[PDB]
Structure 1
């Protein structure tokens, strides 16, 4: 053996953490069918999302904020998006134009 080990990596730190956030923002893609800003729902005709197990069909994703993206993008445009499953309520987390 060869004595004289070199401490390259060390902590010198005292912390503790215990979490694994499994609430992943469920991203899909589809074409904007309608945006009802009065009813606060973006109706996106979405392609097959295997994550939730919803095939190629339309769905109203309810949005928290009428964002620059939401306001500038409209019916006929192909977007990507992100949402969560709040019971049966699809609460739209984010929505981006996939080609720009």
Structure 2
């Protein structure tokens, strides 16, 4: 139920708490490569996403599915 992904951060919205990630195929849930919105709960996850947005560096992340909400459980940026 914890799903892992990778991609590039393309957008962040602090009102909706949404990180837009252009992610790779995720075979565990049968999703193709897409640009999709993930919800963050913690300022740390947002600050990692914001540094990824600046650099364009690849990001690894995990989330769970609640319908239209993909809830971020972790995020790592890679220099």
- Give TM-score scaled by structure 1 length: 0.64
Structure whose residues are more often strand by fraction? 2
Deviations 1:29-68 (A, max 9, x none): 0011112122201100101111111111100000111216
Which whole-Å CA distance do the structure 1 matches of 2:43 and 2:52 have between them? 10
Asked if 1:49 corresponds to 2:26, the answer is yes
Report the alpha carbon displacement of residue 70 of structure 1 after superposing the two structures with TM: 5.0
Structure whose residues are more often helix by fraction? 2
How many residues are paired up? 76
Deviations 1:64-90 (A, max 9, x none): 112166567546221010000112311
Question: Corresponding residue for 1:65?
Answer: 42
Which whole-Å CA distance do the structure 2 matches of 1:61 and 1:92 have between them? 6
Partner SS for 1:80: strand
Partner SS for 1:77: coil
Uncovered stretches (5+) of structure 2, i.e. residues with no partner: none
Partner SS for 1:94: strand
Cα root mean square deviation, aligned? 2.2
Uncovered stretches (5+) of structure 1, i.e. residues with no partner: 1-23
Compare CA radii of gyration and give the structure with the larger one: 1
